[PDB]
Structure formats: structure tokens, C-alpha cells
């Protein structure tokens, strides 16, 4: 921000940051040496406001907005000083509008194989528009050491900081200028939240796919489907990535198909995201 010496000042009620849809009052007070202003004007990003403006003091004026819904607006007020045909800038002010944070829910922490990271994400919820922060707390059920991590999206906690036992508590706190919520605590066991290394499809009746996982017990799911059909066909596996995983599929001739696969540590809670779409137009 470049500094502009103001010949006055501006102030907003309820405040410069307010809930969307609130009625707001903007006040502007002239303080210009040798100048009892004839009039005072308000501009929103250079557009003159011509209504709901009220002369109060001989020096103060008020602009009033109803159900103010814009997330951002820069405001300028100027004075018509006598002895001049031009307007002296009094001051400007930035106002902004949003909502207070919803309670973060759907908190989930997982560890992708070979990452060294625990990835905690959550549903922040309703868009807040304004600047909100997130503090992820981590508590060891063994030692009760608490760590806090600041983020504006999600968080990767390095596994080297999770060596105080395996049972942990994680909650996510959200805060902006309009409110501050906190999530229900999630208890995790580091061994229960692991997702096997990604699985990938490579070559197209026979489909070649493989993963670098080293998890002892891995279960998988491959689903196929004619591009134009809408019901998936899931073929459940219990695979073993010793050698490459090839999967044979019957299918009609000159038709285009789609395949995806996903795997998990047999029995664990989470899976991994489905693969990207592997297309295949077979011959006639």
C-alpha cells in the first residue's frame, strides 16, 4: 500500500468488515486547513453515490447502504472547498463483507505410503469471502504434547513429529474477523489411516496396471463400463503386486470403454481415489 496523507478520516459502523447483507453507515469528516466545505461527496471505486447521504456536523457526512452484499469495495469522500471549483480528497477506506466460519467437519487425516506426511483435510463449509485462518491442533494420547499448525487450506504434518505414540487427537479451528469455530476431535491411529501407493493403468481385452506399494494385505477394485452405459461393473480383487497386475476382460468389438481402479490396505478405513479414466476403443 502506498501512503496517501488524508485531510480527514473515514469510519464505518458496524465496522469495516461486516456480515453480508447488513445495513452499514459510512462516515467522513473533513479536516482541511481553511475550508468549511460547501458539500461532501462519496464515491465507490470512482462512482458517485447520489442518495442516502446525510450532512451531520458542518464537517461530517454519512453514506448509508442497505443490504450490502459486495465482498469488497474501496470508498472515497471528497470536499467542495470554497475558493475552488475542484474537489479535495478527504480520505479513502476499504470495506469488505463476508460470513463467519462454519464449524469445520468431516475432519480426516491419512498417510499416503512413502510420503512421510500425514494429510489432514476437512470441509470448511460455507464460503466466508473474507480472510479466515485454520489452526490444526495435534495431541498425542500417549504424552499429551500439543502442536499447532497454521494453514489457509489443509495441512501436511511431517511423520517425524508424530513419533510420540500412535494414537493422536486432531481438531481444526477456524477464525476470521466475524467469528471463530472449532471442530469435534478426531482420534486416529497412525497404523489405521494408511493408503497404499497409487495404482496406475498403462496398456490396453487385457489391461496392465501396477503399484509400488509394499503393504502386506492389499485389496483392490477395478470397475469397467461402456463409455455410454451408466451402470459401473466392479470386479473386486485381493491383489499382490509381486509382479504386474494384468486383468482380462471380455468386451464387444467396435465400442469405446472406460476403466478405473482403486486399492486399500485390506480392512482399513479409507481407500485411495479412483484412477484417472483409461479409455479404450476396441477393434471390429
Amino acid at each position: 500500500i502506498t501512503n496517501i496523507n488524508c485531510s480527514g478520516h473515514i469510519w464505518v459502523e458496524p465496522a469495516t468488515i461486516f456480515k453480508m447483507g447488513m445495513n452499514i453507515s459510512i462516515y467522513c469528516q473533513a479536516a482541511i486547513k481553511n475550508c468549511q466545505p460547501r458539500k461532501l461527496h462519496f464515491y465507490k471505486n470512482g462512482i458517485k453515490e447520489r442518495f442516502q447521504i446525510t450532512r451531520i456536523n458542518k464537517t461530517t457526512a454519512r453514506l448509508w447502504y442497505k443490504n450490502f452484499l459486495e465482498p469488497h469495495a474501496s470508498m472515497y469522500c471528497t470536499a467542495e472547498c470554497p475558493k475552488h471549483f475542484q474537489e479535495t480528497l478527504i480520505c479513502g477506506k476499504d470495506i469488505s463483507s463476508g460470513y463467519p466460519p462454519d464449524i469445520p467437519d468431516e475432519v480426516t487425516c491419512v498417510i499416503y505410503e512413502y510420503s512421510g506426511n500425514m494429510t489432514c483435510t476437512w470441509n470448511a463449509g460455507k464460503l466466508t469471502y473474507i480472510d479466515t485462518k485454520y489452526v490444526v491442533h495435534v495431541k498425542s494420547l500417549e504424552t499429551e504434547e500439543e502442536q499447532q499448525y497454521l494453514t489457509s487450506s489443509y495441512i501436511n504434518i511431517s511423520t517425524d513429529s508424530l513419533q510420540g505414540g500412535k494414537k493422536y487427537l486432531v481438531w481444526v479451528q477456524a477464525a476470521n474477523a466475524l467469528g471463530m469455530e472449532e471442530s469435534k476431535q478426531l482420534q486416529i491411529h497412525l497404523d489405521d489411516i494408511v493408503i497404499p501407493s497409487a495404482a496406475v493403468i498403462s496398456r490396453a481385452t487385457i489391461i496392465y496396471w501396477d503399484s509400488q506399494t509394499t503393504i502386506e494385505k492389499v485389496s483392490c477394485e477395478m470397475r469397467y463400463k461402456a463409455t455410454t452405459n451408466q451402470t459401473w461393473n466392479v470386479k473386486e480383487f485381493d491383489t499382490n503386486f509381486t509382479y504386474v497386475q494384468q486383468s482380462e476382460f471380455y468386451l464387444e468389438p467396435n465400442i469405446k470403454y472406460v476403466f478405473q481402479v482403486r486399492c486399500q490396505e485390506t480392512g482399513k478405513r479409507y481407500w485411495q481415489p479412483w484412477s484417472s479414466l483409461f479409455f479404450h476403443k476396441t477393434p471390429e
Epitope: 502506498t2 471505486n45 470512482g46 462512482i47 469488497h72 474501496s74 477506506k93 476499504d94
Partner: nanobody, 120 residues
Framework: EVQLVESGGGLVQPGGSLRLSCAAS????????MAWFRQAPGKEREFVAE???????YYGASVVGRFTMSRDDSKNTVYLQMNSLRAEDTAVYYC??????????????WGQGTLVTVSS
């Protein structure tokens, strides 16, 4: 890139006049606010004028009445007519472009500046 290049700087007498130019390019001119600033030796950068496509134009208290800003959106240029020049106006004059959704006092672009000396 974008570019703001000023012109019209030079020497002038106390009481004289002159006019600065500023050619603008790269960004959408109509939607940006254009501003003149100045910076005397040692003294700090100060506001002198600003003008919008809508026509809204306001001035710093120090130069209102004596100075007059205008802008040709076709020619993508702003001007600053400086009259009744006093020695106080001896300073380098800067052209500035302000984006609307930015702050009310954050200018993303600045010209190199033209020096204006008011002798005596």
C-alpha cells in the same frame, strides 16, 4: 509488460505553468484509476490528483485549484496542468495506475517520473 512514461518535465519560473503527460499501455485503461504523485527531495511521496474513466477527479489539498488533471481514454493518456507554480512544487512527478479491486491506496504500476524544477 505494462508501462507508464511521463513527459513535460523541465524548468519553470515561480508563477509559471506547464503540463505533464503520461502514456499508458499494457492494461485495460478504462477500468483503472490513474493518479499523479510527487516526491520532493528528502520529503515523502505525496498525492496530487487522481481521475477515473467515469470522470470523478479529486486532488490533494496542497495543489487543488492550482493543478488540474484530465484523462483521454482514447489516447490512453492522463495530463496534469500545473499553474501558479510555487517553489514548493519542485519535485519528481510520478504517474500511477490503481486496480479497482485492489485497495483504495495500492497502485500496481508506476512511471519512472519527470523532474519539475521551479527556479526563482
Amino acid at each position: 509488460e505494462v508501462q507508464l512514461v511521463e513527459s513535460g518535465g523541465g524548468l519553470v519560473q515561480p508563477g509559471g505553468s506547464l503540463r505533464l503527460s503520461c502514456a499508458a499501455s499494457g492494461f485495460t485503461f478504462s477500468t483503472y484509476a490513474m493518479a499523479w504523485f510527487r516526491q520532493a527531495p528528502g520529503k515523502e511521496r505525496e498525492f496530487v490528483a487522481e481521475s477515473w474513466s467515469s470522470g470523478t477527479t479529486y486532488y490533494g489539498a496542497s495543489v487543488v485549484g492550482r493543478f488540474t488533471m484530465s484523462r483521454d481514454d482514447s489516447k490512453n493518456t492522463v495530463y496534469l496542468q500545473m499553474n501558479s507554480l510555487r517553489a514548493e512544487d519542485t519535485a519528481v512527478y510520478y504517474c500511477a495506475a490503481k486496480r479497482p479491486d485492489a485497495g483504495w491506496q495500492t497502485y500496481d504500476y508506476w512511471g519512472q517520473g519527470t523532474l519539475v524544477t521551479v527556479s526563482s
